[PDB]
Amino acid sequence: RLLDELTLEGVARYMQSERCRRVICLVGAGISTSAGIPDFRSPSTGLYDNLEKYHLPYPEAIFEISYFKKHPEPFFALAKELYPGQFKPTICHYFMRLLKDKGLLLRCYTQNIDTLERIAGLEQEDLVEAHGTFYTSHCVSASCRHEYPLSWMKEKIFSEVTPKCEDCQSLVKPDIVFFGESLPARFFSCMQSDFLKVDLLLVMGTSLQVQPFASLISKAPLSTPRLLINKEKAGQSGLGGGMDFDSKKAYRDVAWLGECDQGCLALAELLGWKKELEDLVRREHASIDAQ
C-alpha cells in the first residue's frame, strides 16, 4: 500500500512523496456552505428541508427538467433567493488553488454550479463541472438555443420576470444539468483519461448519493489513496466502488471528519502550506471586495 498510516498525516506524507504527482479532487455542496450556500441533504439546513413554500408535488421537482419546463417559476424563485450577494470562494477552493500552483492538480470534478472554483483561480482545463454552471444560459428550443450572459439572467431573476428568449419567447435556463439531462461529454472523456493516471483522490463536501458522479471514486486504480474531508463518512459499501475506512481489509481509504475548511487547513499545515493558504485566502478575499 502507498500509505504508511490511514490518517491525514499518512496522506500528507504521501503527498510529499515522488509518486504522488496527479491529484483529482471530487467536491460537492459541502465545500461551499462556508461561503453561505447551503447543501442539499444536510438535515434541517439542506435545500430538501426548506422547499415547502414552493408548493411542489415532490421536493425533487424543482430540480427536474420536465417539471421546470412546465412550471419554471419555483426554480427561479429559488435562484433569486439563493443568488449569493458575493461569490466568495472558501478556504477549500483556495486549497485546490494551492494544489494547482504546486503542479499536483490533474483535475477538479465539481458537482457544484456556483463557479467558486473559477473565482478561486482554477481554469477550464483544470475543471470538469459535471452538473454544468449558472454562468451561461441558453434558450431551450432545438432551433433557437440563443445564449445569454449572467448579467441578463441575473437582472431577470431578481426582477422576478421569468426568463424567456427574446426572439422565440421560449424558456432560457442556466446551463445546469437538471435531473434528466445528460452530463457534459467532457465528464466522460476527461474521466477515461484522468483515472488511468491518478495518484490521489481528494473527496470533499459530498454525500456521494447521486450517480453517475459517485461511481467516479470506483474508477481509480486499486492502489490510489482516497482521502475524504467531510462532516460524515460517505461512499461506503447506491454505489459501485466502495470507501472502506474501518474493515479488516482497509488499506487506502482515510476519512477526516469535520468542516471542509478546517480539514484543508490541517492538511496544508501538515504539508507546510498553512501559512501560504491563509495568505492566499486573505489576499483574494480582500481583492474581491474591490469590484
Known binding-site positions for Zn(2+): 139, 144, 165, 168
Catalytic residue among 131, 138, 146, 285: 131
**Is residue 110 at the binding interface for Na ion, with CB under 5 A as the rule?**
no
Question: Going residue by residue from 236 to 275, which x/- string records binding to its own copies, judged by CB under 8 A?
Answer: xx-------xxxx-x------x------------------
CB of 159 to its own copies, least distance (A): 30
CB of 231 to its own copies, least distance (A): 7
The closest alpha carbon to 196, from 24, 25, 28, belongs to: 24
Question: Going residue by residue from 23 to 42, which x/- string records binding to its own copies, judged by CB under 8 A?
Answer: ------------------x-
241 binds, among its own copies, Zn ion, Na ion, none (CB under 5 to 8 A by kind): Na ion
| DSSP structure string for 19-37 | S---EEEEE-GGGTGGGT-
Residue ranges at the known binding site: 29-33, 39-41, 111-114, 139, 144, 165, 168, 206-207, 230-232, 260
**Is residue 241 at the binding interface for Na ion, with CB under 5 A as the rule?**
yes
Count of residues of this chain found to bind Zn ion when the rule CB under 5 A is applied:
7
How far from 59 is each of 65, 67, 180, CA to CA, in Å? Answer: 13, 11, 15
The closest alpha carbon to 258, from 231, 235, 234, belongs to: 231
In 3-state terms, the chain is what percent helix, strand and coil (to 5)?
40, 15, 45
**Is residue 71 at the binding interface for its own copies, with CB under 8 A as the rule?**
no
200-204 sheet: strands from edge to edge = 127-129, 105-110, 23-27, 200-204, 226-230, 253-257
Vertex 38 angle, CA 109 and 288, to 5°:
75
Which residues contribute to the site for its own copies (CB under 8 A)? 41, 43-44, 48-49, 57-61, 64, 67, 209, 231-233, 236-237, 245-248, 250, 257
Catalytic residue numbers read 131
